Amino acid sequence: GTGYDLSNSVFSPDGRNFQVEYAVKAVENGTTSIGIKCNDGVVFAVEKLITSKLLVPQKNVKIQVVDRHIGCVYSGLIPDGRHLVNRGREEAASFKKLYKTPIPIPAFADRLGQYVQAHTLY
């Protein structure tokens, strides 16, 4: 039948999760942002559409830091992005508090990964 795309955790007959795919549409509709890995670091950059002359220049920052060594940038629904960084920050604080050392990027990535994957289970 149909209706497989109305509820979030449902598998369509071809094994897909339509809500996750519709989410992607929201991402593609967003501003473009990138990242470049260099020989000893990484660079992040993003496009900030100037809706009007009324936007105070340089003020509405989009890139966010996590702990003191991680940068995050995203495209799509900005509020969802912040929500994810907030979790990332708690995720990083928790890790440092227990292990003393600031959280490794691979570890941090999976923290974000498991959290997002979790939002496709219900």
Added chain:
Amino acid sequence: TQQPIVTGTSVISMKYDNGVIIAADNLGSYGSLLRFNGVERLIPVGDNTVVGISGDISDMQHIERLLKDLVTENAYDNPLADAEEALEPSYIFEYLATVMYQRRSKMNPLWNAIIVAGVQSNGDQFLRYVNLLGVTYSSPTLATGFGAHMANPLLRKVVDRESDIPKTTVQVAEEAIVNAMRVLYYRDARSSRNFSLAIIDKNTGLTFKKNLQVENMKWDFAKDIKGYGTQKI
């Protein structure tokens, strides 16, 4: 409710015309055993604040972690973290004060005595004390534990009231404080000869001096003293 185990003794400080000075020896005592000697009890926060801590060391290390987090957290989504929106000494203090009082109110205190020294963004000197009871106060000079009885009287001979602040130079002040550290080494049985000193000047910034030592002590007259009354040799 707990009981301190590894402890740090006195923390002395005072303010002068352009800033504030604060010092503390490098000892972590374990009862009467002078167990640890490389303990830094002066915690700098940014470059306008130094937090001196006495009392239970395990709790001090915990206050340390709290302070590092404050700095991290303040940076988040703050494009002015190193400018107009950086941590002021008064912010650091009010935070700690808040925690100390909440902890005593839950009958589980952070067994310490803290002195927050620093310079506010508008140049003002900041010197305030907070302890395990959550009690707080300010004075031109402030000392914890033993230094409250022996350091304060000396330091107060330099800056007796507010009006003496502008008349006190960094030299005079650092001298008073260095002498006080010697006196404490003379009469405090839980003190070390090594210590750290820090200056927070509205012009020269934060100067943190490590590995100082009490010097120029008087012990020679000890040879002339024998017996405890009638003994002659």
